[PDB]
């Protein structure tokens, strides 16, 4: 479809297609990770743990909330996460 | 009639996409080719494009549909080596 967002892992930023927009925050989160994984490389025992997604505010998005209800098309969103 | 501009440094090239249903990697093939022509650097000259960004720095994944990840007439920056 049309609906899309960018997600900041640290300084690296990743565009995720959300077709609908009707996807739950937790679905989004995984989708963001997959792409980030691809963008960043590549260590044999790598791992990433996402704690939460936010607005630039620090406004915290509930995991079970529909995306288009909690954000707008083409919003920048930050991930609070760990990795390596 | 979907289309995008790709930025190779300061040179901007316009690529047609049909409907925009082509992958982000297809785009890159299209853009390299066109950019080669527009500056015609060398018979030997080699080029590698690492990633495609939006203005913000928003990476576009290679296996994603273009019209899904970008908008008609968007301006995109190529991150590349030459």
UniProtKB/Swiss-Prot annotation, chain B:
The lineage of its organism: Eukaryota, Metazoa, Chordata, Craniata, Vertebrata. Acetylated. Deacetylated by SIRT2, thereby inhibiting Schwann cell peripheral myelination. The gene is Pard3. The chain holds residues 2 to 81 of 1337 of the full protein. It is found in: Cytoplasm; Endomembrane system; Cell junction; Cell junction, Tight junction. The modification Phosphoserine is found at residue 26. Isoform 1 is predominantly expressed in lung, glandular stomach, prostate, ovary and uterus. Isoform 1 is also expressed in brain, with a high expression in the cortex, hippocampus and in the striatum. Isoform 2 is predominantly expressed in intestinal epithelial cells, kidney and prostate. Contains a conserved N-terminal oligomerization domain (NTD) that is involved in oligomerization and is essential for proper subapical membrane localization. The second PDZ domain mediates interaction with membranes containing phosphoinositol lipids. Adapter protein involved in asymmetrical cell division and cell polarization processes. Seems to play a central role in the formation of epithelial tight junctions. Association with PARD6B may prevent the interaction of PARD3 with F11R/JAM1, thereby preventing tight junction assembly. The PARD6-PARD3 complex links GTP-bound Rho small GTPases to atypical protein kinase C proteins. Required for establishment of neuronal polarity and normal axon formation in cultured hippocampal neurons. Involved in Schwann cell peripheral myelination. Targets the phosphatase PTEN to cell junctions. Component of a complex whose core is composed of ARHGAP17, AMOT, PALS1, PATJ and PARD3/PAR3. Interacts (via PDZ 1 domain) with PARD6A, PARD6B and F11R/JAM1. Interacts with AURKA, AURKB and SIRT2. Interacts with PRKCI. Interacts with PRKCZ. Part of a complex with PARD6A or PARD6B, PRKCI or PRKCZ and CDC42 or RAC1. Interacts with LIMK2 and CDH5. Component of the Par polarity complex, composed of at least phosphorylated PRKCZ, PARD3 and TIAM1. Directly interacts with TIAM1 and TIAM2. Interacts with ECT2 and FBF1. Interacts (via PDZ 3 domain) with PTEN (via C-terminus). Belongs to the PAR3 family. This is Partitioning defective 3 homolog.
């Amino acid at each position: 479809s049309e609906f899309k967002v960018t997600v900041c892992f640290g300084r690296t930023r990743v565009v995720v297609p959300c077709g609908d927009g009707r996807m739950k925050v937790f679905s989004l989160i995984q989708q963001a990770v997959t792409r980030y994984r691809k963008a960043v490389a590549k260590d044999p025992n790598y791992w990433i743990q996402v704690h939460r997604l936010e607005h630039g505010d620090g406004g915290i998005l509930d995991l079970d909330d529909i995306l288009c209800d909690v954000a707008d098309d083409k919003d920048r969103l930050v991930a609070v996460f760990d990795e390596q």
